[PDB]
Design a protein around this nucleic acid. Structure first.
Ligand SMILES: [Mg+2]
Ligand SMILES: [Mg+2]
Ligand SMILES: [Mg+2]
Ligand SMILES: [Mg+2]
Ligand SMILES: [Mg+2]
Ligand SMILES: [Mg+2]
Ligand SMILES: [Mg+2]
Ligand SMILES: [Mg+2]
Ligand SMILES: [Mg+2]
Ligand SMILES: [Mg+2]
Ligand SMILES: [Mg+2]
Ligand SMILES: [Mg+2]
Ligand SMILES: [Mg+2]
Ligand SMILES: [Mg+2]
Ligand SMILES: [Mg+2]
Ligand SMILES: [Mg+2]
Ligand SMILES: [Mg+2]
Ligand SMILES: [Mg+2]
Ligand SMILES: [Mg+2]
Ligand SMILES: [Mg+2]
Ligand SMILES: [Mg+2]
Ligand SMILES: [Mg+2]
Ligand SMILES: [Mg+2]
Ligand SMILES: [Mg+2]
Ligand SMILES: [Mg+2]
Ligand SMILES: [Mg+2]
Ligand SMILES: [Mg+2]
Ligand SMILES: [Mg+2]
Ligand SMILES: [Mg+2]
Ligand SMILES: [Mg+2]
Ligand SMILES: [Mg+2]
Ligand SMILES: [Mg+2]
Lengths: 205, 120, 111
RNA sequence: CCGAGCCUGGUGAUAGCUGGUUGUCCAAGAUAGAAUCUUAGUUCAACUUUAAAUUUGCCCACAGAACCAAAUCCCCUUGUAAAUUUAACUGUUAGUCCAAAGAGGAACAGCUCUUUGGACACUAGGAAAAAACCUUGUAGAGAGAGUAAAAAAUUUAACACCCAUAGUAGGCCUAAAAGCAGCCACCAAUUAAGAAAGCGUUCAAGCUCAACACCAAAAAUCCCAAACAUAUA
RNA sequence: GUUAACCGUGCAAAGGUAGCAUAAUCACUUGUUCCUUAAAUAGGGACCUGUAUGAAUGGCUCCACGAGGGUUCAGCUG
RNA sequence: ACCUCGGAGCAGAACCCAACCUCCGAGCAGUACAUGCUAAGACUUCACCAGUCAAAGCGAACCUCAAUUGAUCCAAUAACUUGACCAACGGAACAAGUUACCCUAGGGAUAACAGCGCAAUCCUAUUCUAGAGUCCAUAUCAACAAUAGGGUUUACGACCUCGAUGUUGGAUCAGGACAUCCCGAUGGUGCAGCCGCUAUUAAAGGUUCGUUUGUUCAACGAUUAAAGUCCUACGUGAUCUGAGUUCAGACCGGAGUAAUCCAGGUCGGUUUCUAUCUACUUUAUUCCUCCCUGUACGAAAGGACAAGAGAAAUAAGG
RNA sequence: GUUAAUGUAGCUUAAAUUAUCAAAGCAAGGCACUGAAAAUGCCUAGAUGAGCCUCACAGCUCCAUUAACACCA
RNA sequence: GUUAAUGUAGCUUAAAUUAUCAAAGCAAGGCACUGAAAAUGCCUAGAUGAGCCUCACAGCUCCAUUAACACCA
């Protein structure tokens, strides 16, 4: 059906063992689905972050409002929020054990498409309302097409060839040049210098 | 964690372009080194504090010679950031027994065998 | 409120005790384990707690031999009998290459 | 001065608790943990000091270490010079922050908790002053010298102009929906103007567009060095 | 359960009776209402769910009385 | 709530590694009767203590399971051996409450007052155009969210102080901030005008008196041009008050067998200091009447601007 | 909020499983009829969701409730 | 733990063997029915396992219980 289905709060199988909040689930590029499938238009996440259910009800009710379902469709690329988040009730001293299970979230890494769209319309049509839903998200977003996304990678693959600065990040970081692996994380070899925690730096080679 | 690093072996491989910049050539490599420490061992970990007593680089900016064999050369790979490695080149031959009274290093690394203080 | 309780057990210090190439005398414990990790090969015995103990003075070596268990082991013959027909299982095995010979002959008297 | 008088005596009571601990001169010297009516303490270990004895210790390389990322272990060569054992020991066994991997918490704390690594309690320089960031350690004098770290950069939204007739108040649907409440269709007139893209219409009327044609900042005593775009790095 | 006299029911040694009352009386509370005030979280009299009142742990009134604790008309005075 | 021993994660690849961190278990059961005797070599729960294995030998056949547990001294016993939920699990042979009548030693290693850290809670403004607003997102309101800020609350943290940093309200005098309540200056308005709503700007000046409560608050009466939000150690106790709170007294109500106890109530309850030092100690407003005038305005009811005169009240100065 | 306990035929007490008896309700029988009293038969996820087994039965997930503390500051 | 004693028809007291009678339960009979009261018949490894004989009967193996001590240190 050419509309985004109702994604629920609190998936109907409740997990009893609550998970530690590993923030390595946000770091760096997404190894998961980072290229289109049966859809030309999407909102690529240019930064990591957490998508609540309250984030989903914003995009599900704004895309469906501003789309003719006759000429367009829209598919998610993110699952239901599976990771539980623990909140202690405010007004307790620290400790006593890990608190109650409160609300569920899903981790979106950088470079991961969120909701893919397509149909008998162009990128300049969907740019009106996808840029609405872009800025409302808890990370740097940018609505890109297929022809708009792979422009950005030839930019980022010419800029690894074009720069005349003889010191790049990756030549210094993989070699431990000044003793620089002391300050750099062991992920800094692996991502590139282009990332910094949750935040992705696009202006950087 | 921050642990002891290990460097993958495609940085200790020179291109043919690097022999245009530096003077060395891949045929006939240099027999001896000139190593001199240019950083303090302080704020560096204890392995990079104990190789420096192993090569004898305790007094900084004081040059030292070591073989260019790949057993010593692995030790220089750990403490490379502390040190300044230059090749030892000899304009003359080796100093024999009537020569070692008046020798000196001559920065640009020329172990000249006859050091007079007289002009040219 | 501490809903959980119990998980305070110390470690087991269980690993390999004599590593490869080491001169290992008779009766010496080569490795300590549970839920089998290193299997006994030549001149290595196994006690009650699955300890690997050396049976002759020598040098320990580690190979990857072929795993055919006892037909009186009914928990792996029903594992074997559902492999495809080109499969081998390949557990890893420790060894002891014996160094000292088990004795020389000496002249004692001319009687 | 009474929750049990006062004085003398046992009494130099006891105190895992505070306070004090007095010549000069040099030398080595930073704390994995385990128990414990124990976490304000102590015994053991770890660590450290001297003195002995004897031989290797470090750094390490091809080989090697499980099924269900950084790296570490073992380790000849190597560069080096300390290591182990023995004897007698005391002391530390209430730590901090930075980076990193994580954990708890709010993906808060100059927060708490562990591993790895520094620094800190040790001198000196820089970061305005500064414990922990950066440069540096083995010491004295000198009215000598070269250096190390080392001085924040930035200034951002102008916009088209001209021209709009008709099949037709498209059918359906609706009291009434005329390009624009809702449906399916979306041909075609003259050069070219959509069975109409925003308003505006109860419905209309118009007003335009598409086309001809033309060429980032807000808080409490009072901002806060001064200032300077142009003689060669 | 029909606000219930009433019913059936459990359990106890008995199941708080007379009164009295938002108390010097947990909380709701500055309960509600009349009176006093221009206006009253104070006071006075009544209403009672007091779920933590209550009868020599004494109850409830009342005559004098108090350097007792609260309110008050009249005066009066820096 | 827990205290001992076990497995998995945190701790991905020797070992180790915390936690009132996340989950699972255990205080056994069964097969044996050589579950006999001895004895090289080792590992080892970071010490010790216990723990683990085991070649060979002797004598004979021809253990499983993860954890499944407890020291010494003492008792029972001829002997071999057997004795604790000594679970506060390295265990004192046997000992609970209460203290605001308290005392001493200390501690900012360790709390309540304030500072500071932070900003979840809260508060302000943006960004987005849904939904309101008869039609109309942006006159005015505002959901889902996002981006930034402030440090008033309630919390959290425990870094300063326990060889004292005095507390709530009140007095008094106020210093300040602007996120402006009035007074001015304008843009907009679903602004006819009178009235108001919103944003820019402005911190010179002004910001009332009363009944009940300890009250800050709130409610209530009468006002006014308006009865501003806040910070300053919840401004200011070597300036004052102590009514609250919070010692020793006592009740009532509840809990406790009792001593005692309670953010539950109520009656009563010592506020010390003679200033060494720093600082310091003479520099115009707002409203009302009258006017225009009952005009501008509207259809009416209603009703001003700016121009002008006249009155007062306050502050400052005499 | 922390703990503690309870969950029932329509009502309730029960019963160490397998579930009683007494009200209610259902007619029947005595009555001039209604009541009582008999005489009958009924009425039970034992508040749960998986089931380790085999469970009101025992450890939960649990939902509604009932008592306790929520202090010295 | 050491001793001591008890084991019962569905309940209990009995009985020196061979086992009573009184409750319960079973119908019957009197009743308008139910109860009582009769009138009937039942209900017993006498807690055991071998049996020396022939045993609740007597010495055990015994299983469940009930009292006693478990001290002076
Ligand atoms: Mg563990
Ligand atoms: Mg541990
Ligand atoms: Mg003393
Ligand atoms: Mg020294
Ligand atoms: Mg102590
Ligand atoms: Mg800290
Ligand atoms: Mg701390
Ligand atoms: Mg027109
Ligand atoms: Mg009351
Ligand atoms: Mg009064
Ligand atoms: Mg008197
Ligand atoms: Mg050990
Ligand atoms: Mg044998
Ligand atoms: Mg203890
Ligand atoms: Mg203990
Ligand atoms: Mg008292
Ligand atoms: Mg008293
Ligand atoms: Mg004291
Ligand atoms: Mg301190
Ligand atoms: Mg505080
Ligand atoms: Mg609307
Ligand atoms: Mg502190
Ligand atoms: Mg104090
Ligand atoms: Mg003082
Ligand atoms: Mg002081
Ligand atoms: Mg302003
Ligand atoms: Mg007054
Ligand atoms: Mg104050
Ligand atoms: Mg005073
Ligand atoms: Mg003062
Ligand atoms: Mg008095
Ligand atoms: Mg002074």
């Amino acid at each position: 059906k050419p509309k985004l289905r109702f994604i629920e709060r609190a998936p109907l199988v409740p997990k009893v063992r609550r998970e530690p909040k590993n923030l390595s689930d946000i770091r760096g590029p997404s190894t998961e689905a980072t290229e289109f499938t049966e859809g030309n238009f999407a909102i690529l996440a240019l930064g990591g972050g957490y998508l609540h259910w309250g984030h989903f009800e914003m995009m599900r009710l704004t895309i469906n409002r501003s789309m003719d379902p006759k000429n367009m469709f829209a598919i998610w690329r993110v699952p239901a929020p599976f990771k539980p988040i623990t909140r202690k009730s405010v007004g307790h001293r620290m400790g006593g054990g890990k608190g109650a299970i409160d609300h569920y979230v899903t981790p979106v890494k950088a470079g991961r498409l969120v909701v893919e769209m397509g149909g008998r319309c162009e990128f300049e049509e969907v740019q009106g309302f996808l840029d609405q839903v872009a800025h409302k998200l808890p990370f740097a977003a940018k609505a890109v097409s297929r022809g708009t996304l792979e422009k950005m990678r030839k930019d980022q693959e010419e800029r690894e060839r074009n720069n005349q600065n003889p010191w790049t990040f990756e030549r210094i970081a993989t070699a431990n040049m000044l003793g620089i692996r002391k300050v750099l994380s062991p992920y800094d070899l692996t991502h590139k210098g282009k990332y910094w925690g949750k935040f992705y730096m696009p202006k950087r080679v | 964690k921050f642990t002891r690093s290990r460097i993958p072996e495609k940085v200790f491989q020179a291109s043919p372009e690097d022999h245009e910049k530096y003077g060395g050539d891949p045929q006939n490599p240099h027999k001896l080194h000139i190593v001199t420490r240019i950083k303090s061992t302080r704020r560096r970990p204890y392995w990079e504090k104990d190789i420096i007593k192993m090569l004898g680089l305790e007094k900084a900016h004081t040059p030292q010679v070591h073989k260019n064999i790949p057993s010593v050369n692995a030790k220089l790979k750990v403490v490379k950031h502390l040190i300044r490695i230059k090749p030892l080149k000899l304009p003359q031959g080796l100093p024999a027994e009537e020569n070692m009274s008046n020798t000196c290093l001559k920065s640009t690394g020329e172990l000249v065998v006859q050091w007079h203080l007289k002009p040219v | 409120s501490s809903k959980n309780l119990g998980g305070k057990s110390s470690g087991r210090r269980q690993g390999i005790k004599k590593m490869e190439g080491h001169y290992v005398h008779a009766g010496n414990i080569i490795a300590t384990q549970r839920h089998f990790r290193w299997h006994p090969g030549a001149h290595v015995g196994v006690g009650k707690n699955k300890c690997l103990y050396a049976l002759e003075e020598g040098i320990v070596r580690y190979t990857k031999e072929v795993y055919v268990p006892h037909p009186r082991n009914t928990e792996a013959v029903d594992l074997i009998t559902r492999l495809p027909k080109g499969a081998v299982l390949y557990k890893t095995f420790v060894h002891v290459v014996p160094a000292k010979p088990e004795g020389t002959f000496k002249l004692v008297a001319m009687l």
